[PDB]
Ligand SMILES: O=C(O)c1cc(=O)[nH]c(=O)n1[C@@H]1O[C@H](COP(=O)(O)O)[C@@H](O)[C@H]1O
């Protein structure tokens with residue numbers, strides 16, 4: 260098993276994956292903050308304070324009450340300062356012709372500021388083809404949703420295998436997965452795992468939690484995605500540090 | 516087989532489905548316009564001119580360059596005038612806790628103006644539970660995506676059966692399907708079918724077309740969803756009338 264720093268140099272590595280893996284090893288962080296807030300000021304204050312602790316900040320631009328492209332300009336300044344990627348968790352899931360416009364255009368202009376986006380594989384590979392026609396020229400990357408954290412997920416068995424095949428056949432643009440576990444045996448591909456908290460439990464709407472030690476150490480994923488376990492805590496910086504240290508040690512111990 | 520007007524009276528009919536079925540029979544239209552445009556002025560000019568020909572106008576609010584909630588106020592005026600429903604084709608596809616905020620909040624406030632939205636079933640039933648916590652109080656309806664039109668779609672076999680079960684278990688909120696065919700045997704549920712053109716063909720990004728006669732007449736669906744077959748034509752009103760007459764006659768001939 261290669262370190263993040265060695266994976267950053269693999270021959271077939273995507274440039275966005277390489278940038279991410281380098282800053283993960285430099286900063287000793289494999290934590291992605293899920294910045295699930297409705298206020299731009301809270302998003303930016305979290306990005307600035309937690310920036311040093313995270314490899315990535317995941318957005319849902321469509322729940323921000325006061326979105327403007329200028330908010331995203333300020334987020335990019337913080338991402339460059341503290342060295343983290345911006346991942347818009349848009350879960351594109353339409354025909355190729357539609358998703359290319361949803362990615363490039365409208366009010367959000369996602370491709371103009373998001374290093375990474377993700378897509379569901381259920382529509383077939385046209386979803387990736389449509390996104391890549393915007394994303395390749397803008398030097399972006401994409402994650403495919405191979406497994407989900409929620410109760411009753413149908414992203415299992417042949418579905419997960421189809422996501423891995425689709426990623427591996429679009430390696431010019433697809434840099435990894437949303438998954439609960441290592442699903443690809445190819446080390447060029449990132450595994451990001453949501454549904455993470457230190458304590459056992461879930462929410463009232465089908466979310467299920469596993470610990471950083473379980474998903475990084477036992478299930479072999481690379482990065483934990485954490486929302487409420489950080490966001491709902493009083494001290495979000497100390498919560499982020501708890502999650503960072505948990506995910507980083509689980510990674511080191513798997514490396515041996 | 517019951518007429519649209521008789522289905523509007525079924526004991527278990529959802530109020531949004533009833534309103535739709537009534538105006539379909541009154542206006543002799545089972546056409547949904549896919550208003551896939553980037554300009555508010557073009558969206559509103561199409562809604563006004565084609566309003567009399569359609570039972571429904573389907574939006575992708577996130578490809579509109581000049582979206583404002585005031586554009587949607589003007590669209591509601593036209594929907595009330597000409598009698599059609601507004602369907603935002605957002606394809607919610609996240610955990611329940613996330614989709615409730617994407618539906619109610621952010622810049623778009625989708626639930627404030629959309630009669631109908633749709634969701635993918637791949638995350639499990641929490642996606643429906645989250646949406647219904649916003650949509651039930653706002654007297655809205657939802658469609659579940661049981662089949663897709665695009666090449667390589669994984670929405671087949673057990674996946675399609677899971678979508679039908681999920682709809683039937685959330686009939687307080689779910690009023691039907693995006694599908695290529697009749698998938699539910701319960702007449703209270705609407706079937707809306709995209710991937711429709713009069714001529715054989717497809718697009719360069721995995722879209723596949725079937726005719727109104729095939730999907731309404733042979734496959735037993737209720738409503739055709741048509742984008743480029745209308746939008747790219749010079750005379751969009753005559754194109755809409757061609758599609759309306761095709762879908763309506765296919766429906767009548769299946770009724771016998
Ligand atoms: O794509 C995601 O990040 C995602 C996929 C998935 O399977 N489960 C999942 O929870 N997520 C997202 O990750 C975050 C989880 O947040 P918490 O449950 O608060 O930690 C939310 O923003 C979800 O939208």
Ligand SMILES: O=C(O)c1cc(=O)[nH]c(=O)n1[C@@H]1O[C@H](COP(=O)(O)O)[C@@H](O)[C@H]1O
Pocket residue numbers: 353354357549551573575604633662663664665693709710711722740741742743744
């Ligand atoms: O939900 C939809 O309407 C949808 C589902 C599907 O399986 N296929 C499909 O094409 N659509 C949408 O319906 C429209 C099809 O447009 P045309 O191919 O131009 O007629 C697009 O806006 C798609 O986003």
